[PDB]
Amino acid sequence: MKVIFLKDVKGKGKKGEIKNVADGYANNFLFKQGLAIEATPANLKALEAQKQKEQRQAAEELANAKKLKEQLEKLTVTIPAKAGEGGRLFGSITSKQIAESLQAQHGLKLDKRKIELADAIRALGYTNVPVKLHPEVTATLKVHVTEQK
Amino acid sequence: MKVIFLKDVKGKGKKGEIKNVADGYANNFLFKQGLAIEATPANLKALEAQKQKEQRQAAEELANAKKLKEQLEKLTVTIPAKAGEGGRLFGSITSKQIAESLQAQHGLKLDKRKIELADAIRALGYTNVPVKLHPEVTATLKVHVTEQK
């Protein structure tokens, strides 16, 4: 009996792992723990549709990360800050500030989790910060810390 | 008369811009300044071959930048340095040092031009530096500056 696996596969085979399972056992265990479903020509086409949309989405996303990477690499975030000791800052500029100045000045709302800053910026000057927009899309954000007051 | 443009097009149409130019004029001016060539069925197939190889290459490159991006994001460059003044360095760690420590410790020979460091690192700690491996492939290099002596 052909079956559409809903869960127990390589994690969640819900994508559409269609395998011919033993009838009965299928409807006695798999079908019992919601693991699989009847490979009816409806729930087969209906599966195809979901896989087709998941594939479209994944592609929109990638395409978006790519356009977004282009917007970012033309910018320059400007974060002014109180410094003294040879350019050295009083506090530290971190991912939230950078994320905020980016929204405020460039109209971009980016999750601070994507701003791959390691150690918090603690000095006046320019810093190129990497931004992980997607598994295979990283952009360089130029950050500029200027002395205020 | 069909002609294979060798130069004067959008920069260098040498890719294979095959256009039907007026016979005579072609062989009197274009053919004269090496701009175009006879669209013979040999120099047409021979063009196809070059376009086909240029397309293969461009793809190898991209594929390589992508694998290379994976190798880099697993590393951690360790550059020790003389510091004093509250972690502050005596000199500055720049792209050449980073490039060198990368070769020396990880067996990777990368052009320092790809290490998108802005202002030279002048303090002990960790710094994520962007690396432009290709027009659309950037990786994050984690750099670790440790106090020596």
Swiss-Prot record, chains A, B:
One Pfam family per UniProt: Ribosomal_L9_C
Stored InterPro entries: Ribosomal_bL9, Ribosomal_bL9/RNase_H1_N, Ribosomal_bL9_bac/chp, Ribosomal_bL9_C, Ribosomal_bL9_C_sf, Ribosomal_bL9_N, Ribosomal_bL9_N_sf
GO CC aspect terms: ribonucleoprotein complex; ribosome
Keywords carried by this UniProt record: Ribonucleoprotein, Ribosomal protein, RNA-binding, rRNA-binding
Gene3D superfamilies: Ribosomal protein L9, C-terminal domain, Ribosomal protein L9, N-terminal domain
GO MF annotations, alphabetized: rRNA binding; structural constituent of ribosome
Biological process according to GO: translation
Function summary: Binds to the 23S rRNA.
Family classification: Belongs to the bacterial ribosomal protein bL9 family.
Identification of the protein by name: Large ribosomal subunit protein bL9
Species of provenance: Geobacillus stearothermophilus
Upper lineage: Bacteria, Bacillati, Bacillota, Bacilli, Bacillales
Gene: rplI
